[PDB]
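Allow me, if you will, to draw on your knowledge of protein folds for a short while. I have a record of one protein: its chain in single-letter code and its fold written as discrete structure tokens. I remain grateful for any guidance, and I place the record below:
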Amino acid sequence: TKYKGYTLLDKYPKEDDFRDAIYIEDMDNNDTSSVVYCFNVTKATPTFKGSVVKVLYNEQFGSSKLFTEKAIKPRVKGDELKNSVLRVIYNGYPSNALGIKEKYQLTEGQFRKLTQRAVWNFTDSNLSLDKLSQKEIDALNELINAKNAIPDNLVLNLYLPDDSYYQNLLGTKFV
């Protein structure tokens, strides 16, 4: 089963400052699209949904070995990385385990943007506060610093592209 990755550049309003909403969709139909996040800030996002270029991906169970091999400047390695990232997805958009969205009155788009940035904090040692208001900065700090308990069962898929010019993508549906 191949997957296609793509962006919806017009999904969120201008005020969210967030065009790169990435989705993954299987090539065989029955199922629908799923939110994913870019795992590599220095690589290219997939093309837009209407693009003539379709960027193709393979699905893999994300392990410690694998998250570490695919992260480019990871802030931490092994299990500490797997856990940090699983926790970001669990607390971030759309899961929202801590109620961070409602605590800082974020729009869906802002929350997703912040989740993307938190992922990058761990995978690329890159925390960008660029163009964020104070409440966005506070939410983003709560996200990367949270040390809450997560279920033991959790696994996410990593989507690996045919062409390594493009980012690896991290799923948000726990298996």
